[PDB]
Structure formats: structure tokens, C-alpha cells
Design a protein around this ligand. Structure first.
Ligand SMILES: [Mg+2]
Ligand SMILES: [Mg+2]
Ligand SMILES: [Mg+2]
Ligand SMILES: [Mg+2]
Ligand SMILES: [Mg+2]
Lengths: 86, 89
């Protein structure tokens, strides 16, 4: 079987690495599109565990309310909710 | 190391497992909730590995309001939407 907690953990890692890659290297095709899609699909922006990357991602219009829940319902929370059925 | 291919495979399997339980187990509140969340979040209904099941999935009200046999035929399946999520499309 696929364990919920493990796949949620793996997806959060995928998102985190993408967030990092999205701000570290700029004017690049991959990382920013992945991030934008996660943000639009899950309705979130950044991660409470990565505030500096979250700031960079806000400054660079990679996020679509969202602000009211910026860290109350961050992308890690939405990923958990996806696999938990919330 | 994060492995995009393997994560996508595991998400698809997770969905398929939940869908299969959702149609056969009446007390599977979690499985039903999982598939309903995937369907709403990814804007899909059913998978390409379980095409024959889509009729029961709909009858079971596991797809978002408006979903019906014909409307769903003009939509990508959940596996493609899962692939799209991890490829940024
Ligand atoms: Mg490149
Ligand atoms: Mg949700
Ligand atoms: Mg269940
Ligand atoms: Mg389940
Ligand atoms: Mg949605």
C-alpha cells in the first residue's frame, strides 16, 4: 500500500525543493511553473517552515483569502488535507 | 533526493486504492472523502486504470456537482491531472 503520512511527506519535500529552486535560480522554466500550479491548485502560498522563501515567492508574484490564511492554511497544510480528505 | 516520477506513481496508487475502497465499502468515510477531495481539487472524476468503475463512482456521488456520464467523457482523468500537477501544467 501507499501510506498517507509517507506520501504526504514526499509531496511536501517535492514542493519545498521546488519553492527553493523557484527563487534561487530566476528566469528558468521549471521550478516556477511547478510552484504556481501547486499554489493555484491547492489555494495556498508558501510554507510556515520556509518564511524567507515565502517572502521571495510573494515578491515575485508566484501566488494567487490567501493572505488572511497565508500561514494558517499554508501549502503543507493543504497537502496534508489532500491526502486526509479534508 | 526528491523523485518526481516515483511520487507521481505513489499519488496515483493512493488515489486508485481510495477509489476502489470508496465503491465497495459503505463505512469507508475516509476513502470517500479522499476521492471527493481529489476530484474537486484536480477537477477530475475517475482514473484510466479503472475506467469500467466510473459508472459506480458517479452513482456513489463521489464526483462534484454537475458530474454526469457524458460531461465526464470530455474531461482528462485523475491520473493525467496528477501528472500535470507534478509537471507544472
Ligand atoms: Mg532548466
Ligand atoms: Mg482540500
Ligand atoms: Mg476509509
Ligand atoms: Mg483512505
Ligand atoms: Mg479547487
Amino acid at each position: 500500500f501507499v501510506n498517507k503520512d509517507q506520501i504526504a511527506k514526499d509531496v511536501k519535500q517535492f514542493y519545498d525543493q521546488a519553492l527553493q529552486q523557484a527563487v534561487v535560480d530566476d528566469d528558468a522554466n521549471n521550478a516556477k511553473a511547478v510552484v504556481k500550479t501547486f499554489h493555484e491548485t491547492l489555494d495556498c502560498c508558501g510554507s510556515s517552515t520556509l518564511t524567507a522563501l515565502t517572502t521571495s515567492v510573494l515578491k515575485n508574484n508566484l501566488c494567487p483569502n490567501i493572505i488572511s490564511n497565508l500561514f494558517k492554511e499554508d501549502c503543507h497544510q493543504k497537502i496534508d488535507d489532500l491526502f486526509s480528505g479534508k
